[PDB]
Structure 1
Amino acid sequence: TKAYAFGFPKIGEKREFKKALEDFWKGKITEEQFEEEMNKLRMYMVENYRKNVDVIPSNELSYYDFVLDTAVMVGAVPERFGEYRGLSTYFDMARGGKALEMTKFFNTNYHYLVPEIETEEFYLLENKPLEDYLFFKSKGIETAPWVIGPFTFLYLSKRNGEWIRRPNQMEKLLESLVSVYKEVFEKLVENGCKEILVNEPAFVCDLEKAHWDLILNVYRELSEFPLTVFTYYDSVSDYEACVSLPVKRLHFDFVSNEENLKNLEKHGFPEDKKLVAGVINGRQPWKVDLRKVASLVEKLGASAISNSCPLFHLPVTLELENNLPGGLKEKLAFAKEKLEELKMLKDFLEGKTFDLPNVDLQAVERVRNLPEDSFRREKEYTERDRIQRERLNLPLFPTTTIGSFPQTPEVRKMRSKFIKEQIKKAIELQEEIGLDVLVHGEFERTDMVEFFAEKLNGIATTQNGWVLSYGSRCYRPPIIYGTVTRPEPMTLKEITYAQSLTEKPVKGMLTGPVTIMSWSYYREDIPEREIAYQIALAINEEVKDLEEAGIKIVQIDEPAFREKAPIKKSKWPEYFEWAINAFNLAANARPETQIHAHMCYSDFNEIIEYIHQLEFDVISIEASRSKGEIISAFENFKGWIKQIGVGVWDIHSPAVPSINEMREIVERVLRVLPKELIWINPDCGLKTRNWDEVIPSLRNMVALAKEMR
């Protein structure tokens, strides 16, 4: 049984990767010292592989993003960067003032950099795969270069400001692109490379037959090379086309989906090919029952095994996690432990090992037995709207903000090591500024998920369970290990105090159930919807307590509402059914309670009918970057009647937008939609901004409002 593994985290057990990058950028280490920090990590990764599997990947230590690496490889360096000068240019492309766009990588919380294709002519600008291959070879260690495939590369890229995803957009570019891959592979083979790991996750997207016609052509051109093709994150819909590719070895992800298995059972698997069975989950941290996996492997008839998807979606090692709830650690397995699982699975399958590891009722029942009426509020919007508008007495074009305020070094220090003082001062400033609806600033919160994850039962947090989000930024995902419930009030202290300082309405501030799940690990042996409902009910407990304490407005932040959706559109209806229900459980509030849903993602076009089913009264959106055009989905929706909070200010920029810059967005929004619907707010929270920027911007949106009235 040939064991593969791929995507082992690059960050190191003490986040040496992060320290190396940030030291280099700050300039306190040299370029040579940086390369040495990276070489240490290279060896660290390879040692982990060597101890556990048969095929050792190289070309995995990307200095910022592997999709950016692929772009550099094929000479896709946009004109604005000038000549490619190495690390200096690489990092300017990654994190500079004119960096490539950053976006989520498939349905994961890793963010890649979007290549911008300016010329139809690719060339081999840099051969990193050979460089890494020779680095290890020179040490007497054979490795298989890990590369992004040509189809996936184009599928992840943009040209003329839009995706390159129609078959008639990809054809000509593929011919030129493949020429460069051919050159890279020839070089590898000429230097004795025996196997190359080619990653084609885009095979699992919604593709058309015309796509597969192009893919076949591509791989016919590369049929002379020792390629093993990987796919993951979902099933490959055109199974027959995929297994017909002229490649000797083909990997499938048999964990994220049921269709790969069903399809292989239905159509079989070509005798002229070897199946690599992706059977160990790279996205969840649960020890698996190896006896069951072994049976699956046998059923599949696979001669090789591997993780299902890249391991970099997991933390490095569970080893030093010694303050987890009782019994938990024994059920977990992070990246290092996943490699050891593949090792044991290979051993067991080879007959070399015989001993394998074994591996809140009231809340559970309440969810399983929810009344059918649980997913709607007492009164519908029209009736709610009247009651709320009378209770609040807000002017036309009311102004508000999204929740978080700038964090002084003091604020960050104190939390790391008062809140009542910051809240007072923040509420004071808002009043003096002239804002209509106020917030408490979230000074007491590390981030919108962790803050709540730490206060809920059924959820654990780790000490060192770091996972790469992008560049040098890591986060520790919570682990939802059991029934979720809310023992004690989470935010009442802060909001209550806040409201007691002003006659103006202060927002309750909560994070939705879908977002909490999207940024956390959770259990696989429970339906996703059950987990979502459990969390939703726990959040609703907080909502009740807030409105009981006299809070008139409550905001539920659901930034991941679309991000959490399946890769395949055919799976959207089932997903949104529970996502909607979960949100509605959380938002189940009294008619006099005005609910705000904050959803700062880029477009609503394909999901407006789902949004329409949500029980919020106001929805805040990010409209600045699109100059209001994002409103298209809403104005195009016959029957839209709910209030929209229009983002007039890009909070990711330090600039202070002019009254006129804000005005343009609001006016684009009033082309169709009734003025009574419109609120004015920033795109999102202000936690990453400076007070020097925030205060004048706020005064500007207040002034724009008064002007619009």
Structure 2
Amino acid sequence: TKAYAFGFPKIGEKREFKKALEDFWKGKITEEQFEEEMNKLRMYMVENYRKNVDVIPSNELSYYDFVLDTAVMVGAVPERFGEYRGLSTYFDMARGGKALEMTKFFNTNYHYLVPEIETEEFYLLENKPLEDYLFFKSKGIETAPWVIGPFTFLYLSKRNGEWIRRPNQMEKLLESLVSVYKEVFEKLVENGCKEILVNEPAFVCDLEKAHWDLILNVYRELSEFPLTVFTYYDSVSDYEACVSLPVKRLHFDFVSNEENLKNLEKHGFPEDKKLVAGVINGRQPWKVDLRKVASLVEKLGASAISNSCPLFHLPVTLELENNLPGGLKEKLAFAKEKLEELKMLKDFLEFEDFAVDLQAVERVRNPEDSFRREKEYTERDRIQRERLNLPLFPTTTIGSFPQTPEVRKMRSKYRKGEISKEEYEAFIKEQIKKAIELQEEIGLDVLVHGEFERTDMVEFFAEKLNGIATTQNGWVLSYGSRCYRPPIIYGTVTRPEPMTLKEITYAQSLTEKPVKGMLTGPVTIMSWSYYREDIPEREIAYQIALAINEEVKDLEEAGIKIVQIDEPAFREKAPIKKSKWPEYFEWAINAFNLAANARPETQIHAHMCYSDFNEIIEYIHQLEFDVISIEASRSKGEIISAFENFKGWIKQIGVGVWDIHSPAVPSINEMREIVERVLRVLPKELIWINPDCGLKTRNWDEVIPSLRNMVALAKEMREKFE
């Protein structure tokens, strides 16, 4: 049985990739030295593949993004960049003020760079897949170039600001594109390349028959090449149509869904091609029963096997993770150990009761009114307004404030244990007190504690929740040179003790103005983490939801009038197929309402970072919040159209009027344009004024003046609509 593997992490066991990248950018090392560091990573990867699988991928060490590489390869370099000079122009397209837009790669935590097609004509600008081939060739190693298929490349790109996803939009462009590919392939085939790994994950989106008619012709023109196509993240939209493509080797993801299998054993698989069962999950870190897996591969008479989806979604290795909770490590498996499981499967082909809180589990299993707030919005509204006494067009912020390097250095010392709880506790309060006075002096109406004690919105909570563990070196690539260690939800989730009361209560005792409670939603917490697969995702979300609700009662009991639940993954966690959204939102909505099941007089705020709400608004309407903050600066308020077009919308809206990803200071005229836009249809008493999002990434010198304008804006605004 032929064993395949792809997506093995490119970062290195010590994140040497990130270091080489940052050393080159800062000027600490030359391109030659950079390349040397790179070539070493290449050997590190091929070495791991060789020891476990039969097919060793090639062209996988992207210096920033593989979609970007695909774009450079076909000549898609925006005119603003001039002539492609090399890494220099390559990094200009990846980072900095002229860079391509970045965004999430399908439903994962990896971000790619969006190509911008400015001409209908593509051409072979650079054959990176051949370069890399001859490279592992010189070193005496045979590799199968790893490329992103032509259909997917276009589907992940834009033209004149719009995704290129309708069949009429792609048709013309594709013809000119496959020309570059065929050209690339022939060259590979000439130099002896015996196999090419083509990636078409876009085959799993909700495609029209017309898409397939188009895809079919794409692959007819490339039929003379030794292509092996892979699909993952969900089931392919048209099974029968997919198994008809002019390809001899076809990969399927049998882990992330039940449709591929069901389809394959209801309509069968063609005898003119070979199946490569993707049976090892590349998105979860759990050790699996290679038994029941061998049974699958056997019953399906699959000729090959491989991981379901890329392995770059997992950490490099579990080897040194020896500080994990009791028994956890024994059940884990990261990238390298996934490669080892494949080998064990090949060779053979030739733990549920863990961490459980039955009272918690049962608690979840058992009233209905725990998902519904005792009163309807219109009633809660009256009370809250009376309690709050806020002015018309009340101003507030999203939560975090810039971080002094001292703030950063100190929070790390507490983790490392260098200082004591008391000493860190004292430091944070001085940071909070300083923040509260500044905000009061600026003129804000509703204040926040600054989140100086939090590394990030998910990690902070993972370390305080039972059933969730964090790793030491489990670093995963997000984009460019930035990595993140995703927590691991290994058991039933419960909160042992209050997690935020000390800072929130303290912050509030220093002011007569309302100080927001600051929580992260249940979906977002699991969206950024790995979690158990042996239980419905809905259950894990409910467990975390209960944990957060318990925290909400504490804040209320303590006298906090406003509580904010950040739920930016509400939409991001959503299935890739919009057709599978119904089921998903059902439990995602319940999880949020369960977490925000507060008393009538507690004003709940929901914060979301989405650039557009037209496709989920019917789902948002169902969340029992009292106000929802949104990022309206980029659209200059136009993002409000989904709200003003929603019949019967009556909830408050935190209009983001400032783009916190740019260090610039939004002028008053600037912020007004947006507010004015939002006041076109919606009642003035529904509007709040705030920044697009949190300020943890900005600097105080840019924040103070921007905040002053924002307060100055609301002042003027109140004078008008007096």
Contact 1:24 1:31 in 2 (8 A): yes
Per-residue deviation, 1:409: 1.1
Q: Secondary structure at the match of 2:136?
A: helix
Tell me if the contact between 2:575 and 2:581 (Cα under 8 Å) persists in the aligned partners: yes
Residues 153-175 of structure 1: per-residue CA shift (max 9 Å, x gap): 00000000010000000000000
Q: With structure 1 as the length reference, what TM-score do the two structures score?
A: 0.98
Within the candidate set 401, 425, 429, 2:434 is matched to 425
Tell whether 2:451 aligns with 1:442: yes
Cα distance in 2 between the residues matched to 1:374 and 1:661: 43
Distance 1:6 1:357 in 2: 30
Shift of 1:139: 1.1
The answer to whether the 8 A contact 1:536-1:583 is kept is yes
Superposition deviation, residue 686 in structure 1: 0.2
CA displacement at 1:48 relative to structure 2: 0.2
2: CA distance, partners of 1:686 / 1:2: 51
Work out whether residues 100 and 115 of structure 2, in 8 Å CA contact, stay in contact via their aligned partners in 1: yes
| Structure-2 separation of matches of 1:475 and 1:254 | 27
Determine the C-alpha separation between the residues in 1 that align with 2:325 and 2:288.
19
Counterpart secondary structure, 1:29: coil
Structure 2 counterpart SS, 1:109: coil
Q: Which runs of 4+ in 1 moved over 4 A?
A: 354-359
- 1:356 and 1:140, CA in 2 relative to 1: closer, same or farther beyond 3 A? farther
- The answer (yes or no) to whether the contact 2:230–2:251 under 8 Å persists in 1 is yes
Q: Does 1:137 align with 2:133?
A: no
Structure 1 residue 23, shift from structure 2 partner: 0.5
Q: Residue in 2 aligned with 1:372?
A: 368
Comparing 86-95 with 415-424, greater Cα deviation is found at 415-424
Per the alignment, do residues 377 and 195 of structure 1 end up closer, same or farther by CA in structure 2, a change over 3 Å counting? same
d(CA) in 1 for partners of 2:181, 2:162: 24
Q: 1:345-385 CA distances to partner (integer Å, 9 max, x unpaired)?
A: 000111xxx9999990000001011x111110011100000
What is the SS of the residue equivalent to 2:615? helix
| Aligned 1:126-525 pairs, distance under 5 A | 126-350=126-350, 360-369=357-366, 371-417=367-413, 419-525=428-534
Query: Structure 1: how far apart are the matches of 2:165 and 2:241?
Result: 18
What's the secondary structure of 1:695's corresponding residue?
A: helix
Contact 2:604–2:626 (8 Å) recurs in 1: yes
Gaps of 5+ in 2: 415-427
**What secondary structure does 2:569 align onto?**
coil
Mapped to 1, the partners of 2:232 and 2:321 lie a distance apart of 29
Distance 1:359 1:502, change over 3 A: closer
1:567-613 deviations in whole A, cap 9, x for unaligned?
Answer: 11111010000000000010000100000000011111111111011
Q: Tell me by how many angstroms 1:641 deviates.
A: 0.2
Kindly state the Cα deviation for residue 140 of structure 1 after the two structures are TM-superposed.
1.1
TM-score (norm 2): 0.97
1:121 is displaced (CA, Å) by 0.1
Change (3 A) 1:421 1:527: same
SS class of match (2:605): strand
Q: RMSD of the alignment, in Å?
A: 1.8
Instruction: Work out whether residues 445 and 451 of structure 1, in 8 Å CA contact, stay in contact via their aligned partners in 2.
Output: yes
Aligned counterparts of 1:457 and 1:358: Cα–Cα separation in 2: 10
Structure 2: distance between partners of 1:33 and 1:158:
35
Q: For each residue in 1:588-643, what CA deviation from the matched residue of structure 2 results, as whole angstroms up to 9, or x when unmatched? A: 00100000000011111111111011010000000000111110110010010000
| Cα-to-partner distance string for 1:683-707 (whole Å, 9 max, x where unaligned) | 0000000000000000000000011
- Contact kept in structure 2, 1:331 and 1:359, CA below 8 Å: no
For the residues of structure 2 that align with 1:103 and 1:454, how far apart are their CA atoms?
Answer: 28
CA–CA distance in 1 between the matches of 2:38 and 2:705? Answer: 43
Q: Deviations over 1:250-292 (max 9, x none)?
A: 0000000000001001110000000000000000000000010
Which residue of 522, 538, 541 maps to 1:532? 541
Q: For residues 457 and 660 of structure 1, what CA distance do their matches in structure 2 show?
A: 48
Match of 1:12 in 2: 12
| Contact 1:649–1:681 (8 Å) recurs in 2 | yes
Segments of 5+ residues of structure 1 without an aligned counterpart are none
Q: Are the aligned partners of 1:367 and 1:533 in contact in 2 as well (CA < 8 Å)?
A: yes
Helix, strand or coil for the counterpart of 2:197?
A: strand
For the Cα contact (< 8 Å) 1:122–1:180, is it kept in 2?
yes
Contact 2:313–2:476 at 8 Å: present in 1 too? yes
1:554 positional shift? 0.3
Offset from partner CA, 1:431-477 (integer Å, 9 cap, x none)? 00000000000000000000000000000000000000000000000
Q: Distance in 1 between matches of 2:459 and 2:494?
A: 15
C-alpha distance in 1 between matches for 2:139 and 2:387: 74
CA distance in structure 1 between the partners assigned to 2:609 and 2:217 by the alignment: 40
Distance of aligned partners of 1:219 and 1:358 in 2 relative to their CA distance in 1, 3 Å threshold: farther
Does the aligned pair in 2 maintain the 1:195–1:228 contact within 8 Å?
Answer: yes
Q: State the distance in 2 between where 1:92 and 1:58 align.
A: 25
Contact 2:355/2:467 (8 A) holds in 1: no
Q: 1:359 to 1:124 in 2, by over 3 A?
A: farther
Superposed displacement of residue 114, structure 1: 0.1
SS at match of 1:261: helix
Question: How far apart are residue 552 of structure 1 and its match?
Answer: 0.4
Moved more, 407-416 or 394-403: 407-416
SS at match of 2:112: strand
Inter-partner Cα distance in structure 1 for 2:545 and 2:293:
33
Matches of 2:608 and 2:233 in 1, distance apart? 25
Contact 1:291 1:356 in 2 (8 A): no
Cα deviation 1:111-141 (Å, max 9, x = unaligned): 0000000000000000000000000011110
Q: Distance in 2 between matches of 1:678 and 1:641?
A: 11
